[PDB]
Design an enzyme around this catalytic site. Structure first.
Site, PDB file in Angstrom:
ATOM      1  N   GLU A 104      -9.757  -3.693   5.048  1.00 41.68           N
ATOM      2  CA  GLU A 104      -9.529  -2.651   4.054  1.00 41.68           C
ATOM      3  C   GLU A 104      -8.383  -3.097   3.139  1.00 41.68           C
ATOM      4  O   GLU A 104      -8.497  -3.049   1.913  1.00 41.68           O
ATOM      5  CB  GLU A 104      -9.183  -1.316   4.724  1.00 41.68           C
ATOM      6  CG  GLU A 104     -10.389  -0.552   5.287  1.00 41.68           C
ATOM      7  CD  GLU A 104     -11.378  -0.116   4.205  1.00 41.68           C
ATOM      8  OE1 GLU A 104     -10.953   0.548   3.235  1.00 41.68           O
ATOM      9  OE2 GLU A 104     -12.585  -0.430   4.321  1.00 41.68           O
ATOM     10  N   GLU A 158       0.782  -1.235   0.000  1.00 42.17           N
ATOM     11  CA  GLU A 158       0.000   0.000   0.000  1.00 42.17           C
ATOM     12  C   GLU A 158       0.818   1.291   0.000  1.00 42.17           C
ATOM     13  O   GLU A 158       0.558   2.199  -0.794  1.00 42.17           O
ATOM     14  CB  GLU A 158      -0.955   0.002   1.197  1.00 42.17           C
ATOM     15  CG  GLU A 158      -2.010  -1.094   1.149  1.00 42.17           C
ATOM     16  CD  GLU A 158      -2.402  -1.586   2.533  1.00 42.17           C
ATOM     17  OE1 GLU A 158      -1.531  -2.152   3.226  1.00 42.17           O
ATOM     18  OE2 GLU A 158      -3.574  -1.410   2.930  1.00 42.17           O
ATOM     19  N   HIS A 172       0.007  -3.084  12.574  1.00 38.94           N
ATOM     20  CA  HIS A 172       1.297  -2.360  12.413  1.00 38.94           C
ATOM     21  C   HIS A 172       2.024  -2.316  13.760  1.00 38.94           C
ATOM     22  O   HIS A 172       2.381  -3.397  14.270  1.00 38.94           O
ATOM     23  CB  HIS A 172       1.063  -0.956  11.841  1.00 38.94           C
ATOM     24  CG  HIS A 172       0.475  -0.953  10.471  1.00 38.94           C
ATOM     25  ND1 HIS A 172      -0.889  -0.955  10.255  1.00 38.94           N
ATOM     26  CD2 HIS A 172       1.053  -0.948   9.251  1.00 38.94           C
ATOM     27  CE1 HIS A 172      -1.127  -0.951   8.958  1.00 38.94           C
ATOM     28  NE2 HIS A 172       0.050  -0.946   8.320  1.00 38.94           N
ATOM     29  N   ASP A 181      -5.907  -6.525   7.499  1.00 41.17           N
ATOM     30  CA  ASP A 181      -7.263  -6.120   7.878  1.00 41.17           C
ATOM     31  C   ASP A 181      -8.189  -6.161   6.660  1.00 41.17           C
ATOM     32  O   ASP A 181      -7.739  -6.427   5.547  1.00 41.17           O
ATOM     33  CB  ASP A 181      -7.258  -4.715   8.496  1.00 41.17           C
ATOM     34  CG  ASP A 181      -6.592  -3.681   7.604  1.00 41.17           C
ATOM     35  OD1 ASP A 181      -7.069  -3.463   6.470  1.00 41.17           O
ATOM     36  OD2 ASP A 181      -5.588  -3.082   8.045  1.00 41.17           O
ATOM     37  N   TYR A 215       4.620   4.198  10.106  1.00 40.67           N
ATOM     38  CA  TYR A 215       3.323   4.746   9.605  1.00 40.67           C
ATOM     39  C   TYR A 215       2.681   5.695  10.624  1.00 40.67           C
ATOM     40  O   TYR A 215       2.668   5.353  11.824  1.00 40.67           O
ATOM     41  CB  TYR A 215       2.373   3.597   9.262  1.00 40.67           C
ATOM     42  CG  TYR A 215       1.412   3.886   8.137  1.00 40.67           C
ATOM     43  CD1 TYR A 215       1.846   3.921   6.823  1.00 40.67           C
ATOM     44  CD2 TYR A 215       0.070   4.115   8.384  1.00 40.67           C
ATOM     45  CE1 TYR A 215       0.972   4.184   5.781  1.00 40.67           C
ATOM     46  CE2 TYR A 215      -0.818   4.376   7.354  1.00 40.67           C
ATOM     47  CZ  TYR A 215      -0.366   4.409   6.048  1.00 40.67           C
ATOM     48  OH  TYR A 215      -1.235   4.669   5.028  1.00 40.67           O
ATOM     49  N   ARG A 217      -0.398   6.470  10.850  1.00 47.49           N
ATOM     50  CA  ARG A 217      -1.776   6.064  11.089  1.00 47.49           C
ATOM     51  C   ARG A 217      -1.813   4.718  11.773  1.00 47.49           C
ATOM     52  O   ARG A 217      -1.581   3.687  11.151  1.00 47.49           O
ATOM     53  CB  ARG A 217      -2.513   6.013   9.758  1.00 47.49           C
ATOM     54  CG  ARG A 217      -2.199   7.235   8.915  1.00 47.49           C
ATOM     55  CD  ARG A 217      -2.970   7.273   7.620  1.00 47.49           C
ATOM     56  NE  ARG A 217      -2.540   8.397   6.795  1.00 47.49           N
ATOM     57  CZ  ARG A 217      -1.468   8.396   6.007  1.00 47.49           C
ATOM     58  NH1 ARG A 217      -0.698   7.323   5.908  1.00 47.49           N
ATOM     59  NH2 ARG A 217      -1.163   9.488   5.321  1.00 47.49           N
ATOM     60  N   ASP A 262      -2.223  -4.844   3.741  1.00 48.36           N
ATOM     61  CA  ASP A 262      -2.488  -5.116   5.150  1.00 48.36           C
ATOM     62  C   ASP A 262      -3.460  -6.272   5.324  1.00 48.36           C
ATOM     63  O   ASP A 262      -4.313  -6.508   4.468  1.00 48.36           O
ATOM     64  CB  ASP A 262      -3.034  -3.863   5.839  1.00 48.36           C
ATOM     65  CG  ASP A 262      -1.982  -2.785   6.007  1.00 48.36           C
ATOM     66  OD1 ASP A 262      -0.782  -3.095   5.858  1.00 48.36           O
ATOM     67  OD2 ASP A 262      -2.262  -1.600   6.288  1.00 48.36           O
TER      68      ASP A 262
END
Ligand SMILES: [Zn+2]
Ligand SMILES: [Zn+2]
Ligand SMILES: [Zn+2]
Lengths: 298, 38, 492
Positions: C90, C8, C340, C88, C294, C296, C86
């Site tokens: 999303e 990503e 993460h 998850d 990251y 976020r 990732d």
């Protein structure tokens, strides 16, 4: 979706059937500058504003006059620490009909308006000989050339205009394609033969202190931006007002054979022509000096 | 003309220089080239 | 042939391609690449049909054409494509979209998850892989569609009943509700007056001792007016003061957890005056320059390597008394998950002062992140707390003191200012008499609830699990632009 649609459909109905309440006018003792009538307190996506009940009357008796409600901003004192919020609450008036505090707004350089926290569920209002300052709206701060007062940017049914906050002066400037603001209003010429490129509109030619520019006929919606090419002006040279013709006389192409555009030299208040390659300036310019066109490096 | 007797020199107080000037200049502009006017 | 790996974040790709070198071609989707744009017009606008078994119409983002394109041709010289987004839902969905935009055959696709940058991770990545989880993908499609329906079907109702340009949304509308409730809370607040009485005294020696009145006739002392306050001062002025008890006790202070997106924003806001959006801009720069992880994240977790790295640093730069016997533990939420990691320096050995390629504010943010990360793994601060109980007629008075004995973690993250308990108390024993010097009455008023700040509202949202690290800032702006709330003096 089944649950959601059950709620949505119910909300669509009339308030009596359990539908969503549409906005509600709450009147108050204030004189509409157009018709003197009592005035009511209203909420729009733009904010919170003062309206005259004639808005709900058919055209014959319709009144579209509106007033902006400038709120008194709470100025919490950092030096008061934990006190700063408490004193803010102390500062507020309290509604006559209920214990709820009241929130405060300016209607005139002589008048000030208090409104209850549970408005419009609570209809208490108060009016005070309180005088403070008022802003017509908000945006690019500008100084009104006719009175020196602050001027702001406003939106309405005609797009974007610029108006002065002093209620005694209606001097209104306007937005233009490639500048912050335009003095009062200016002298336009339309071209049906120049099509827009990001939109289906057509281009019109305009003048102002910023310079001479092309603009799209649905300006508030299209908001499309470019300067005219010299070859374009040459193509529509007959339409150009008598003064503008010289720009069509200007050299259409530079020594490299690139194409040329028309620019305003603010430092000398005069039009000039310049060339661009890959949208970047070529560093070449030509100016008009005493009935002749002269050219060289920028 | 003025029949002065002597010459005096001193530092310039800002109010004095401001009193000299008949106006303030606020932009780098000199003269227009379409018409040779300041 | 050559293997194609897709992640990503670009920064993360460049880093992976390294710990893997040639033979492979790493790239990034840089986001979603694709997304949404009875009544047919409404359905065309929504991009999903609730009345036709949820058939949808995804379409490349108007700003990912290149990315998608450059990713196309790269699929040619590729033997087996490795979707490494990732784990998850999303990320799982981004993988699903990539697979449907690049085309090809299922077998040509593989799913891998990278633990860390360490080779001990990028290796295990291709060791035991798998394929995309359809259930995970559909879970994300369900969320995305529910958010769509609400926004595109409720807003119009608002346009009709209230005004044009209005909007409603699962996250958006409750954020506003929170501000509206706090507003009403403040406007209805009525300050309550209360008084306090302090007494200056002298010990049998001659030392000064400040006392606070706590009880009268065994009931909490809290006069509400000047009259009552006077009745009491009159008695205290004539009373005999004697020490009842002196309780000396060792107390400690503990460091906090490393940062997450929400807490970083709050700390930057309180210690540097940074707004949420600014903090994220600086954090973004730092991440892209490889200084931190990251920006976020919703997890305060730390890898073992990260923990060894910091303990290694604490050991060489502070000594044993600052290094705990074993790693400091925190966060035991039984429902907690793993994602993460926490926001921290990528290399503890890198000081803020050495980032001469970064803006001053980015260096300040880095320093905040650094210190929080190192203090987190240091030992507790130790104090000697003293509490003095005093009797005077029917009144009870108290005095509390504290003397720092060992800074521990506060060595790297100092106490901005001394607290009320950061003081000393004169030597006095039970039974000692005290001589009254003066009595000072003080009027006070309870204060209304504090107004929200950008970081403060974010804190409330995350507390209720309302938003996402990558959307908090965005939420704070939307509610303003829509005209629902406004910010003044950095308060809502
Ligand atoms: Zn009227
Ligand atoms: Zn009321
Ligand atoms: Zn004016």
């Amino acid at each position: 979706f089944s649950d959601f649609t059950q709620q949505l459909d119910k909300a669509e109905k009339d308030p009596e059937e359990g539908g969503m309440r549409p906005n509600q006018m709450v009147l108050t003792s204030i004189d509409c500058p157009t018709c003197g009538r009592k005035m009511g307190i209203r909420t729009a996506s733009t904010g919170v504003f003062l309206g005259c009940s004639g808005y709900a009357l058919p055209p014959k008796e319709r009144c579209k006059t509106t007033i902006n409600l400038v709120p008194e901003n709470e100025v919490l004192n950092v030096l008061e620490g934990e006190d700063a919020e408490t004193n803010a609450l102390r500062a507020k008036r309290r509604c006559p009909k209920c214990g709820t505090a009241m929130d405060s707004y300016l209607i005139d350089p002589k008048r000030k308006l208090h409104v209850c926290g549970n408005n419009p569920t609570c209809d208490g209002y108060e009016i005070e000989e309180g005088e403070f300052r008022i802003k017509g709206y908000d945006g690019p701060i500008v100084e009104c050339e006719k009175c020196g007062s602050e001027m702001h940017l406003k939106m309405g049914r005609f797009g974007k205009y610029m108006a002065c906050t002093n209620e005694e002066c209606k001097n209104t400037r306007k937005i233009l394609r490639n500048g912050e603001v335009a003095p009062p209003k200016e002298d336009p010429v339309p071209l049906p033969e120049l099509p827009c490129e990001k939109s289906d509109a057509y281009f019109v030619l305009r003048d102002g202190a910023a310079g001479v520019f092309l603009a799209a006929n649905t300006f508030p919606k299209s908001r499309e931006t470019r300067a005219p090419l010299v070859e374009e002006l040459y193509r529509f040279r007959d339409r150009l007002p008598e003064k503008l013709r010289y720009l069509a006389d200007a050299p259409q192409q530079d020594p490299e054979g690139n194409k040329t555009m028309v620019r305003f030299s603010r430092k000398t208040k005069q039009q000039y022509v310049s060339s661009e390659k890959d949208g970047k300036a070529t560093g070449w310019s030509a100016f008009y000096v005493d009935g002749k066109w002269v050219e060289g490096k920028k | 003309t003025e029949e002065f007797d002597a010459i005096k020199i001193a530092l310039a107080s800002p109010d004095m220089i401001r009193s000299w000037s008949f106006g303030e200049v606020k932009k780098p502009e000199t003269i227009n080239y379409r018409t040779f006017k300041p | 042939g050559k293997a194609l790996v897709i992640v990503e974040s670009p920064a993360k790709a460049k880093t992976i391609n390294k710990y893997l070198g040639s033979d492979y071609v790493v790239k990034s989707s840089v986001g979603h690449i694709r997304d949404l744009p009875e009544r047919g017009a409404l359905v065309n606008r929504m991009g999903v049909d609730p009345w036709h078994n949820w058939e949808a119409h995804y379409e490349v983002l108007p700003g990912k054409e290149k990315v998608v394109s450059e990713l196309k041709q790269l699929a040619e010289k590729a033997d087996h494509i490795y979707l490494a987004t990732d784990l998850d839902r999303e990320g799982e969905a981004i993988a699903w979209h990539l697979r449907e935009v690049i085309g090809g055959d299922d077998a040509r696709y593989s799913r891998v998850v990278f633990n860390e940058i360490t080779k001990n991770a990028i290796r295990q990545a291709f060791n035991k892989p798998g394929e995309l989880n359809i259930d995970r993908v559909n879970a994300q499609q369900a969320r995305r569609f529910m958010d769509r329906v609400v926004g595109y079907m409720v807003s119009p109702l608002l346009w009709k009943k209230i005004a044009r340009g209005l909007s409603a949304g699962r996250v958006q509308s409750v954020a506003v509700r929170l501000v509206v409730e706090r507003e009403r809370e403040i406007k209805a607040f009525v300050p309550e007056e209360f008084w306090e009485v302090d007494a200056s005294t002298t010990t049998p020696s001659g030392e000064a001792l400040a006392l606070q009145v706590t009880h009268q006739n065994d009931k909490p002392f809290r006069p509400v007016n000047k009259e009552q306050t006077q009745a009491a001062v009159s008695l205290l002025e004539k009373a005999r003061y004697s020490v009842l008890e002196r309780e000396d006790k060792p107390t400690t202070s503990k460091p906090g957890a490393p940062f997450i997106t929400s807490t970083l924003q709050q700390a930057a806001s309180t210690r540097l005056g940074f707004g949420v959006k600014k903090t994220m801009m600086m954090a973004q720069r730092l991440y892209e320059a490889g200084y931190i992880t990251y920006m976020r994240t919703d997890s305060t977790n730390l890898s073992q390597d990260a923990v060894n790295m910091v303990r290694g640093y604490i050991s060489d730069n502070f000594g044993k008394k600052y290094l705990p016997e074993s790693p400091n533990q925190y966060a035991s939420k039984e429902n907690s998950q793993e994602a993460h990691e926490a926001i921290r320096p990528s290399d503890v050995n890198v000081m803020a002062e050495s980032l001469k390629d970064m803006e001053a504010d980015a260096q300040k943010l880095y320093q905040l992140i650094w210190r929080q990360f190192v203090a987190c793994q240091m030992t507790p601060a130790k104090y000697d707390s003293t509490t003095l109980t005093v009797g005077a007629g029917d009144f009870r008075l108290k005095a509390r003191g504290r003397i720092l004995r060992f800074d521990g973690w506060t060595k790297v993250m100092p106490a901005l200012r001394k607290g009320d308990e950061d003081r000393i108390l004169p030597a006095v024993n039970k039974g000692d008499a005290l001589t009254l010097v003066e009595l000072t009455p003080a009027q006070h008023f309870t204060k209304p609830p504090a107004r929200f700040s950008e970081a403060s509202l974010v804190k409330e949202l995350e507390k209720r699990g309302i938003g996402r690290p990558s959307t908090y800032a965005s939420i704070i702006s939307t509610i303003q632009d829509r005209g629902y709330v406004r910010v003044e003096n950095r308060r809502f």
